[model samples]
Target: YNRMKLMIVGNTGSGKTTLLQQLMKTKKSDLGMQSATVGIDVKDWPIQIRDKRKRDLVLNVWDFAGREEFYSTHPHFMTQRALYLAVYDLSKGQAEVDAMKPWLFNIKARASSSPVILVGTHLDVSDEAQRAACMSKITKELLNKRGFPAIRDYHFVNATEESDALAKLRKTIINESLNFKIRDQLVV
Candidate 1:
């Protein structure tokens, strides 16, 4: 059976690494803190399904750093063979949101047909302020109004708590992984 990969691509503090840790289930104490990711951090993980005819979906996850230095080389790592969680910091200033554009359009330019979902971070922090909540809601609506080209869905998450949002997003990823394989780019 063939395999697939999931890329966690976002800005430096967008919570990509912590999201990966929460999914991977690190120690509770460790989940409280975050360390930066450099280049690409790769993990090989997949759901075990013993049944035949539906077992080619062993999944890998890659954590790509937010450093501008690697931005130039980003496309080399992108391919339709993977799914992507394009993350953003919901508690961000107006300017920080634009920083996500490079990564987004990089995915748009390179793997436009692959499964891509936007993951909004700072779910806990953002809920603290009225502005945060408003900003997040606006982004969601804006995404639907303006979103196109390589986007399937966008889900906000509280990665620190191992919350339902995180779990459901995992389910979403698995669904997308399976769909990526079965969707036909059919022939005449």
Candidate 2:
């Protein structure tokens, strides 16, 4: 019975808008990334919850252009009930992955008590020669050092697919949303 406001943030070329397009289920040409989103793009969507109560869910997905120049600007982001998604392009070099610390920090610091989601994109494009997988040794350790907990929940996305990655990401968002309310209640 509620809509969620999810803000997508990451470094340049991190595939935030591309993934957002897929999640919104738009045509490849429409959501396809010809150029980086300038400031921010808002796509409002409706989702249905089957197993749970019969309710219509609206998601206001905010795609923030990944530019270092916007880092200090608070108006571009800062939303109530914000789910901060930090995406990194896995196909490229590891710089974006390494740079996630500060970006994630900035998001956390700017948003007043919003939840954070660390995500990896470009899985379909990355290392076509090898099986793509998660490497917690680097990101998890780094996140911990920065005072964020080891991120057990994350998504690996291929920007090209319409539903493949979106399904996973949607489930992840739903889980994260549910977790936000009941996390502290869970006992080992």
Candidate 3:
């Protein structure tokens, strides 16, 4: 029952809240809509990690609000050794990708060793051509050593569907949690 901090940081209105809602909701159809995360929001998700012993994992998922006004105060919550989800909106262009840099930088500055996962959200509403282009641009820019050089991985998600994207997020978190030696500790 040991808990891991999973930070979900992204551009405002890039479907971060929606994606979190989908992950926590019982059914995709039940999640009609989701509003923006104010300041911040947190959820505890209990998942079964794929290990030899089938260990239990509790993710203290932190959904950070993505407005510039809150940017100055983000360091207070960007704790050490947490997994970060740097999400962007595929429906948007390069500007949106550029906008996520500050948040990524904050994470790197505060938690240099923590793993950052670059996620492209809103895939449900975006076309394939646009998604490809936006993803390509983001990959090209962020992969550069001059930018977010410590990113762990990249993912594309459509929050409206109970698809592989969400599953991958969960799997990734579980996998990362194993790296911490306190996996056997109980939180609840």
Candidate 4:
């Protein structure tokens, strides 16, 4: 099993904790919806990459408390080769949603090589127009232009929908985990 790290971040109520619960396959049914993760939490999972490797991948996932104190505490959480699940709740006021960019760039600048999956949370309540709007490439480009590349690899997903949600999550991992050095295998 290869050891890899993932960090989940977003302002409060953005579903960072719930997403972790889903990803980790934890006892989240009882936890309900929580606004913020008190501190940090980690999850390990067995993932299959290819015939090349058949071991589990330690996710070392982190759910950072997205408060004033934690905002300044972000850098310490930024580490090497980490994958970030950056989120924005589609149900809440857009104020905290806007915070995603600065946080993303902060992580990127500190860990340029670190990859991020820009997540649009709370899709269950979002209108079709809003959902469509979130996936618009133009909008994403504009967000990136605004240094909110935290929305960089943006995907509009409702955490409640596990099938589609897991597909998106898998796509993110494949996109970021592929080894370009072995590009010939992917040429087809």
Index of the highest-lDDT prediction: 3
What are the lDDT figures for the candidates, one per model?
0.68, 0.64, 0.70, 0.60
Candidate 3 shows a clash count of 0
Could you tell me how far off, in angstroms, the CA of residue 43 lies in candidate 3 after the best superposition?
Answer: 16
**Which regions in candidate 1 have their CA more than 4 angstroms from the true location?**
26-78, 93-96, 127-148
- Candidate order by decreasing lDDT: 3, 1, 2, 4
Candidate 3 lDDT by residue in tens digits, 123-152: 777788877777777677776554453676
Instruction: Mark the 10 consecutive residues where model 4 has the least summed lDDT.
Output: 179-188
Clashing pairs in 1: none
Highest TM-score against the true fold, candidate: 3
lDDT of 4: 0.60
Could you give candidate 1's per-residue lDDT for residues 111-169 as a string of tens digits?
Answer: 75666787777767664564455456547633543333456777777787777788888
The TM-score obtained by model 1 is 0.61
Q: Which segments of candidate 2 are over 4 A away from where they belong?
A: 1-3, 26-80, 128-134, 143-146, 149-152, 163-165, 181-188
Off by over 4 Å in 3: 26-78, 144-149, 180-188
lDDT, residue 82, candidate 4 = 65
Model 3 earns a TM-score of 0.62
The digit string of per-residue lDDT tens for model 2 on 33-151 reads: 65555556679988886666898888998677765434524454334456778788777745656677787567656764566767778777777432233455344444445455334
- lDDT of candidate 3? 0.70
Clashes of 4: 1
Which residue pairs clash in candidate 2?
none
By TM-score, the better pick of 1 and 3 is 3
